[PDB]
Amino acid sequence: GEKTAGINVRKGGISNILEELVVQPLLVSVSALTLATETVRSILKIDDVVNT
Amino acid sequence: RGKGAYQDRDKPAQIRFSNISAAKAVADAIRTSLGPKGMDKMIQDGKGDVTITNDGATILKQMQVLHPAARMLVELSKAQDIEAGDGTTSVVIIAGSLLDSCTKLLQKGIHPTIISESFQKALEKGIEILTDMSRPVELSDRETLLNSATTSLNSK
Amino acid sequence: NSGMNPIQTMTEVRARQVKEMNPALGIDCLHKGTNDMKQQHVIETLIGKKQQISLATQMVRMILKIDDIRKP
Amino acid sequence: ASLSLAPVNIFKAGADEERAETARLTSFIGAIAIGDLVKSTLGPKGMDKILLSSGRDASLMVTNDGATILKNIGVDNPAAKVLVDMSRVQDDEVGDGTTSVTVLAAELLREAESLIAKKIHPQTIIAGWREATKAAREALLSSAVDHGSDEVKFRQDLMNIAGTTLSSKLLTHHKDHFTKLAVEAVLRLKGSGNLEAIHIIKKLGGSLADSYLDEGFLLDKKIGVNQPKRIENAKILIANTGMDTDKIKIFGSRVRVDSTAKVAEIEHAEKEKMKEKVERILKHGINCFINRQLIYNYPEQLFGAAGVMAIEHADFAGVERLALVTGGEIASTFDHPELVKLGSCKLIEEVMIGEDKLIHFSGVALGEACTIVLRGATQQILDEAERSLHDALCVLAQTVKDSRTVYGGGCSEMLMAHAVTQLANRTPGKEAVAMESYAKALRMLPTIIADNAGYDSADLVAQLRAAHSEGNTTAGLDMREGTIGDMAILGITESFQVKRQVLLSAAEAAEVILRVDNIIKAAPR
Amino acid sequence: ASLSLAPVNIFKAGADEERAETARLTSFIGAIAIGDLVKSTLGPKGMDKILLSSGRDASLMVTNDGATILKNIGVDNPAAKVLVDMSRVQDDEVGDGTTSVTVLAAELLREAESLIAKKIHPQTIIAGWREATKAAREALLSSAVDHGSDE
Amino acid sequence: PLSVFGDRSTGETIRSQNVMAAASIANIVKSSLGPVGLDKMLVDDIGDVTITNDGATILKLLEVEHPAAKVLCEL
Amino acid sequence: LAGEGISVNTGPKGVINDWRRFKQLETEQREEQCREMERLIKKLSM
Numbered sequence A: 001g002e003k004t005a006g007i008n009v010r011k012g013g014i015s016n017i018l019e020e021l022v023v024q025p026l027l028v029s030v031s032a033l034t035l036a037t038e039t040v041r042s043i044l045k046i047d048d049v050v051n052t
Numbered sequence B: 001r002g003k004g005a006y007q008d009r010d011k012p013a014q015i016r017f018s019n020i021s022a023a024k025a026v027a028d029a030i031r032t033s034l035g036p037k038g039m040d041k042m043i044q045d046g047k048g049d050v051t052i053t054n055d056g057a058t059i060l061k062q063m064q065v066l067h068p069a070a071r072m073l074v075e076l077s078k079a080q081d082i083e084a085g086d087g088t089t090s091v092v093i094i095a096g097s098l099l100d101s102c103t104k105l106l107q108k109g110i111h112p113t114i115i116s117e118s119f120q121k122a123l124e125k126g127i128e129i130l131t132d133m134s135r136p137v138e139l140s141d142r143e144t145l146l147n148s149a150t151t152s153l154n155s156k
Numbered sequence C: 001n002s003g004m005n006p007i008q009t010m011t012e013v014r015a016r017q018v019k020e021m022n023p024a025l026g027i028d029c030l031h032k033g034t035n036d037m038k039q040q041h042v043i044e045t046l047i048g049k050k051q052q053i054s055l056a057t058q059m060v061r062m063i064l065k066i067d068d069i070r071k072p
Numbered sequence D: 001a002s003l004s005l006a007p008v009n010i011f012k013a014g015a016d017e018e019r020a021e022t023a024r025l026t027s028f029i030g031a032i033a034i035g036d037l038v039k040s041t042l043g044p045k046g047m048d049k050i051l052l053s054s055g056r057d058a059s060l061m062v063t064n065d066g067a068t069i070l071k072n073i074g075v076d077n078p079a080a081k082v083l084v085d086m087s088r089v090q091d092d093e094v095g096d097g098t099t100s101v102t103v104l105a106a107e108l109l110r111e112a113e114s115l116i117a118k119k120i121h122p123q124t125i126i127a128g129w130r131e132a133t134k135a136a137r138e139a140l141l142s143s144a145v146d147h148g149s150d151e152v153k154f155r156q157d158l159m160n161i162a163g164t165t166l167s168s169k170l171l172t173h174h175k176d177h178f179t180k181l182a183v184e185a186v187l188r189l190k191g192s193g194n195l196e197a198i199h200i201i202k203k204l205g206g207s208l209a210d211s212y213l214d215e216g217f218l219l220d221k222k223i224g225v226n227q228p229k230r231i232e233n234a235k236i237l238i239a240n241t242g243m244d245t246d247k248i249k250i251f252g253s254r255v256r257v258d259s260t261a262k263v264a265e266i267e268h269a270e271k272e273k274m275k276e277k278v279e280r281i282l283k284h285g286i287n288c289f290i291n292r293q294l295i296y297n298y299p300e301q302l303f304g305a306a307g308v309m310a311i312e313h314a315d316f317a318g319v320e321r322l323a324l325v326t327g328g329e330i331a332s333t334f335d336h337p338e339l340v341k342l343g344s345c346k347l348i349e350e351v352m353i354g355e356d357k358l359i360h361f362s363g364v365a366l367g368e369a370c371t372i373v374l375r376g377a378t379q380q381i382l383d384e385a386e387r388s389l390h391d392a393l394c395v396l397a398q399t400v401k402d403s404r405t406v407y408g409g410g411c412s413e414m415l416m417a418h419a420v421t422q423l424a425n426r427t428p429g430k431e432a433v434a435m436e437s438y439a440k441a442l443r444m445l446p447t448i449i450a451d452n453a454g455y456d457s458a459d460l461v462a463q464l465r466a467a468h469s470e471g472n473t474t475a476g477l478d479m480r481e482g483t484i485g486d487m488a489i490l491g492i493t494e495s496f497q498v499k500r501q502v503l504l505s506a507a508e509a510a511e512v513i514l515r516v517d518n519i520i521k522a523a524p525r
Numbered sequence E: 001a002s003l004s005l006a007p008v009n010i011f012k013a014g015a016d017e018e019r020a021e022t023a024r025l026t027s028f029i030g031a032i033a034i035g036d037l038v039k040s041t042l043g044p045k046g047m048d049k050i051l052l053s054s055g056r057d058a059s060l061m062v063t064n065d066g067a068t069i070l071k072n073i074g075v076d077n078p079a080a081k082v083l084v085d086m087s088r089v090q091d092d093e094v095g096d097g098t099t100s101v102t103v104l105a106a107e108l109l110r111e112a113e114s115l116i117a118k119k120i121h122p123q124t125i126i127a128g129w130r131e132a133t134k135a136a137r138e139a140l141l142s143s144a145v146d147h148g149s150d151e
Numbered sequence F: 001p002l003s004v005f006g007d008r009s010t011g012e013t014i015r016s017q018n019v020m021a022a023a024s025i026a027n028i029v030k031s032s033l034g035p036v037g038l039d040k041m042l043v044d045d046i047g048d049v050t051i052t053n054d055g056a057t058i059l060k061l062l063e064v065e066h067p068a069a070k071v072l073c074e075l
Numbered sequence G: 001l002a003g004e005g006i007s008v009n010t011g012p013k014g015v016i017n018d019w020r021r022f023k024q025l026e027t028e029q030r031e032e033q034c035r036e037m038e039r040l041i042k043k044l045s046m
């Protein structure tokens, strides 16, 4: 149930990171996920390579 | 339903495997430049110019990759830089990992169209999960802004 | 090789093997209408399978242990 | 004897020729190769191609459009050149059907190769193909249905056609949203056929579903230094004057005086002339001024002092689109303000798209000009989305011009094949065999459509043929599951113009290629 | 991933491999070329061929026999080699039929190419051909007539 | 798999190479430190001669290829 | 000896590395020869 459990490098282990002040905006993870999924979907719809 | 439709070509499978291998190679290349413990890469172009950088978009665009899938990954990093501004390495790593999974998915005998729709469903569910996990913030809170900036600079 | 869907057929055969105690359920390559290999009389030597597994494991270990190449 | 195989040689060095069998072999090989390459990109389940350029730039292109695929390939086979030019002309005439016409021509030429191998003179094949083309064209014309009179039915038909066109392309993921977008964009033209009035702006970043049709208009130009960045109830004057060191057009004129004071006086006179021109422009009572050409610093500050926006360097397309969307008149003289119509819009402001700033026109008066913002994850995705949207807009504009529609999903092809077979069943001679081959290619088209999806194409095509023979004239391929269904109910429709053009162009190219029995090549440069 | 279409190079200089579609294309092309070459010398109205040796001897030999035509040709397509050896073995076993067997094999392989283009697994084609061969052989045996008693 | 037109060095190899370049640059001028140091006489391959002890002059006159060494020179 | 129409595939893409490796040297040789021929034959002949 620890939603904020993350990798702690200062203590070299696992711990809560909100107390380590490690945060990023939502429109970083959301944007990365959306863009990566779109690129993967675009790549999957390819079946041939033609040289001009 | 019996034997089913026979695959005459086997060329689309080779193309898909080559694209996935190129993307996975790009991710493994920019895999060690992630997080506060990541290290910078040094790039020397055709001229004498030298670049030492940790930015994923800069690393990808500085080096000529010559492969189509790698070029879509470079464009992906550029787009992520345009929209969000950071995470340009994480998006490329995620795309490479997704295609690496698609390798085994295709080998299992799944058409690369069910994979796309299932990935869209997973993306929507993950967007819902991330939105649920998020926390509201206001610009009047200087501490959160300072923490975000420090986290951004932690890996440089 | 037989045109069937690999993952679906293998999963179904594995589930059938788990449900009913029968290690002789295989892939109906010839479409004879059954998955039990005793009636289909598909028989392999135990020595052959054991040698296959052993040799594959040893070669995989040997390949995994190599970490440097020094070609001219 | 022949020129090539003669005791004496009649040719320059490097020039040769190919006789009947050899020329036919090369032409058929080239046509079949082109058809096989362009296919597998046909139908809802068709895939895309990667066009990796071998030049210094090494442009990378991922596309599904057959015409673009055939354009950017080094083609040596002359028959392949004929097919490529066919695809280009098909794209020029209508936005869709390039892959369909190319595949149909290739299949026709394959059947022609089989018939020639069966010892049939090509003229007999050509005559049979002409008869079959006439019969198929008559059947397709009889099959066309029109809904132009009914507004709601015509709108539904437009949505169906846009969805059918976008089903094959990369936009099939968001087909619904993109269909609404394209239909609204075409409907905003108010019947005008100028697709240049629709501007497609590609901005990197953001999901493909983030694309939208702007309610007003967007411009990618800048504003003067000391001019307002936001005005309301704008009265826009669109112009095509110089206003940049504007010189009197007497080319032989010059300044020749005996002192520098006279030079200063002439310079002050020039500045006064520019100021008077700006005053004449301002006499129109305007808020925003858009000039096609550049605007220099003196008119810039003159406009800024009057609180007037001065958008400069808007190209011919820019001023034309602004006039279309706002109703203003492109003026080059300002001596009769009462005879110039000023464009009007509710609000002008600057919007922030991606990392770029664009001028936004909102609440436009006319609005007969659209701007579409495309957002994507890669440049290739943006280019392919633009190409697919262009195809959809072209087909929708053609449907607006001519509202006759036919059913897709192979229904039209199977109906044509049934008509051709019925004609051939009552014709004696080898022309019957030629018409049977024509019908076979027409049936091969939906066969390839079904192949691209991994379906049981043979069974589906046999079922379609049986249904069309029975009397079910609207039966077609149901690509959702892999059965046959009613295309009228399922809403797969095409433009009658597109299908007719595909059929006629394929027949024409097959006929002209089949007529060739000798390919003579000059020495390459 | 294919043996040849991989970033890692697994072959010696000059070695190469051809995958499913490419191998089928080359085999069918070679077989059909051999069949078209040997044919037109079949039946009562068949024509002869000129075989010009490119060696020092420069031997000239006109012939109508399919086996001799297929023997003295430089063949590099492996399927063409298969058909050539078929014709040679047919000539060794019986005196005639060298052209007919090659033409029949070429036509069968052309039909196989069409069937593959129709998305039919080659194993299904092989099974159907085995059954058809059994039926045809039985019919041919039933149609045979013997006159070894009356002189 | 990368298909990048160039050479790539990763891990301890590149670190050791950078340290080698820096140590070589240091050893170039290490003999001209302190009062018991001695000067160097540079030749510009056109007959030009420069006798100097200043480190900046020595490092500017020399042409250096490795970039980690260029870092020390511009330092 | 048929099927000349190929349009090839990513095979040449798989060999771009060696292609450019040889092409850079070829271009350098071409540049050297062009700078040599700007005088030779152009003035030696007449």
Ligand SMILES: Nc1ncnc2c1ncn2[C@@H]1O[C@H](COP(=O)(O)OP(=O)(O)O)[C@@H](O)[C@H]1O
Binding pocket: A007, A008, A009, A022, A024, B033, B034, B035, B036, B038, B056, B086, B087, B088, B089, B090, B151, B152, B154, B155, B156
């Ligand atoms: N102090 C930290 N402790 C743990 N994780 C961190 C810390 N700082 C950054 N990270 C994580 O490292 C990841 C990589 O970020 P970074 O290396 O800057 O490249 P990018 O921003 O392109 O992903 C981020 O997703 C972030 O969550």
Ligand SMILES: Nc1ncnc2c1ncn2[C@@H]1O[C@H](COP(=O)(O)OP(=O)(O)O)[C@@H](O)[C@H]1O
Binding pocket: D041, D042, D043, D044, D046, D066, D096, D097, D098, D099, D100, D163, D164, D165, D166, D167, D168, D169, D408, D409, D410, D449, D477, D479, D492, D494
């Ligand atoms: N949803 C669909 N169901 C059945 N058939 C379709 C559908 N969408 C398109 N098609 C068919 O696919 C064929 C090819 O269309 P497309 O590939 O989009 O453009 P082009 O005509 O240039 O090939 C058309 O003839 C059309 O009849």
Ligand SMILES: [Mg+2]
Binding pocket: B086, B087, B151, B152, B155
């Ligand atoms: Mg970061």
Ligand SMILES: [Mg+2]
Binding pocket: D096, D097, D165, D168, D391
């Ligand atoms: Mg289309």
